[PDB]
Write a protein that binds this ligand. Structure first.
Ligand SMILES: Nc1ncc2c(n1)CCCC2=O
Length: 172
């Protein structure tokens, strides 16, 4: 089943959200011929739509803010699919404001999930994986779907640079 069956509905959703949110977004899709099982195609749309929404709302900054920070004025959102062996890898990348890891740590300490003492030596992945804790901010819901497809998800993010969410699906 080509993934384009899912990806083809996204330019409309992205442009509707950009408009309602007053962002300017350059949306690029790559790898849309990538084939995978019908069950995956039927289920992956919801979690991707959530990731695209997060990027437009929380990641990409309004154009005035990007200019004020010396970034290219219009933010860019790239959705990509490819094969890596017998697995399909889907990426959602934006060049927005990124995730503030300090805020994550503060929030985790408030919620009683980590000691201040242990926050100093947390890895980058340890910190960002708090976002998957249920009720932390829902990245939990994204992970729940990916998990039910026997996939995995990771986040990479750096403040002011942007965010890349990666989803790895088995052949099934
Ligand atoms: N793409 C993207 N960029 C920023 C953020 C998110 N996703 C979700 C967490 C909140 C946040 O700040």
């Amino acid at each position: 089943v080509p993934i384009s069956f899912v990806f083809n509905r996204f330019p409309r959703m992205v442009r509707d959200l950009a408009k309602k949110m007053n962002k300017e977004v350059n949306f690029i899709m790559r790898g849309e011929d990538t084939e995978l099982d019908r069950t995956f195609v039927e289920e992956i749309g919801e979690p991707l739509l959530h990731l695209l929404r997060n990027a437009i709302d929380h990641g990409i900054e309004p154009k005035e803010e990007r200019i004020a920070k010396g970034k290219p004025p219009i933010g860019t959102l790239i959705l990509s699919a490819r094969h890596e062996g017998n697995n399909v890898v889907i990426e959602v990348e934006d060049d927005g404001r990124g995730i503030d890891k300090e805020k994550i740590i503060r929030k985790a300490i408030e919620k009683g999930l980590i000691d201040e003492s242990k926050a100093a030596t947390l890895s980058d992945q340890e910190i960002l994986n708090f976002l998957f804790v249920p009720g932390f901010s829902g990245m939990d819901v994204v992970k729940n779907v990916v998990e039910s497809l026997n996939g995995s998800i990771s986040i990479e993010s750096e403040k002011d640079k942007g965010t890349k969410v990666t989803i790895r699906l088995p052949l099934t």
